Write an enzyme that holds these catalytic residues in place. Structure first.
Site, PDB file in Angstrom:
ATOM      1  N   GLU B  35       0.822  -1.206   0.000  1.00 36.90           N
ATOM      2  CA  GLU B  35       0.000   0.000   0.000  1.00 36.90           C
ATOM      3  C   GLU B  35       0.860   1.261   0.000  1.00 36.90           C
ATOM      4  OE1 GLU B  35      -2.933   0.427  -0.685  1.00 36.90           O
ATOM      5  OE2 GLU B  35      -4.225  -1.204   0.004  1.00 36.90           O
ATOM      6  N   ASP B  48     -11.078   9.627  -8.976  1.00 32.91           N
ATOM      7  CA  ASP B  48     -12.432  10.103  -8.719  1.00 32.91           C
ATOM      8  C   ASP B  48     -12.470  11.344  -7.837  1.00 32.91           C
ATOM      9  OD1 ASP B  48     -11.742   9.006  -6.258  1.00 32.91           O
ATOM     10  OD2 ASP B  48     -13.756   8.219  -5.889  1.00 32.91           O
ATOM     11  N   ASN B  59      -9.006   5.289   2.184  1.00 33.61           N
ATOM     12  CA  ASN B  59      -9.639   6.150   1.191  1.00 33.61           C
ATOM     13  C   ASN B  59     -10.521   7.206   1.849  1.00 33.61           C
ATOM     14  OD1 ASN B  59     -12.279   6.399  -0.894  1.00 33.61           O
ATOM     15  ND2 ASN B  59     -10.254   6.522  -1.851  1.00 33.61           N
TER      16      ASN B  59
END
Ligand SMILES: [Cl-]
Lengths: 155, 127
Positions: B35, B48, B59
């Site tokens: 990650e 997005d 997130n």
């Protein structure tokens, strides 16, 4: 729509299903969500025989995923010595750096794979290479307190 | 702060990640590696408009509040996931996997850890 099925077969070690999908014109360089090729997944899961078959059928030996990792990155970090040599003998960049600047030597050193570090050194691994944080393979071995690895890298 | 592998394994152990729901410690160290490359400062803006923060790349659309994305299911500002103390990221991570779907919510774990010898990520650390 065969490329998605060849990716699954490569990661899963389906030696026989990889052959059948290949002969039927499946794209040997298909990409999944993570940018992995079948050769990426076969090296990740340690499937030596599928690795050779993909190479015979023209898989890109230095293909990079979404983070810039080559199949040699993944094989060296997971300790799959057989696959590392097959990748090297087929033209894998031993000093490839991903997006965070890590080389195969960094990844094998981080997980204490002595035999793989020695093979990489033999093939010209750069001990002075640094990731984006300024760390060499030696620094990584010291951080993990791996004295045996430190000795390997000190010569 | 950039953790060493064993250093983060020891810290994750202190925060209750070697005894959580069968998700053995190596799973978490492997996930943090792919990650964030052990970097608590890592921040990557998604396509997005949302952003992934911290050592486990949590997130901002769903789990924290950054003021430029409003769910905040971890009840935490996204900036709080960026400090050298991993308490906030761990507690939020424990909430993400505990919905039922489990570790499969972890994209980096699913693509790079799931199916490998995750015990190697704590191998060689004196815990
Ligand atoms: Cl539990």
């Amino acid at each position: 729509d065969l490329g998605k099925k060849l990716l699954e077969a490569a990661r899963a070690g389906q030696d026989d299903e990889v052959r059948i999908l290949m002969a039927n014109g499946a794209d040997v360089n298909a990409n999944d969500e993570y940018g992995s090729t079948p050769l990426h997944l076969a090296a990740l899961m340690g499937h030596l025989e599928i690795v050779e078959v993909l190479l015979k059928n023209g898989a890109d030996v230095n293909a990079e995923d979404t983070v810039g990792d080559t199949p040699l990155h993944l094989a060296a970090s997971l300790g799959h010595l057989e696959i590392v040599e097959v990748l090297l003998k087929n033209g894998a960049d031993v000093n490839a750096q991903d997006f965070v600047g890590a080389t195969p030597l960094h990844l094998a050193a981080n997980l204490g794979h002595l035999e793989i570090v020695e093979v990489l050194l033999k093939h010209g691994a750069d001990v002075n290479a640094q990731d984006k944080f300024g760390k060499t393979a030696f620094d990584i071995s010291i951080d993990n307190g791996n004295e045996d690895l430190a000795e390997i890298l000190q010569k | 702060k950039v953790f060493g592998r064993c250093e983060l394994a020891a810290a994750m152990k202190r925060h209750g990640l070697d005894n959580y729901r069968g998700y053995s410690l190596g799973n978490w160290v492997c996930a943090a590696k792919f990650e964030s490359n052990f970097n608590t400062q890592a921040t990557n803006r998604n396509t997005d408009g949302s952003t992934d923060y911290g050592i486990l790349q949590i997130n901002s659309r769903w789990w924290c509040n950054d003021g430029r994305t409003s769910r905040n299911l971890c009840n935490i500002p996204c900036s709080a996931l960026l400090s050298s103390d991993i308490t906030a990221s761990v507690n939020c991570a424990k909430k993400i996997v505990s919905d039922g779907n489990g570790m499969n919510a972890w994209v980096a774990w699913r693509n790079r850890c799931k199916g490998t010898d995750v015990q190697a990520w704590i191998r060689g650390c004196r815990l």
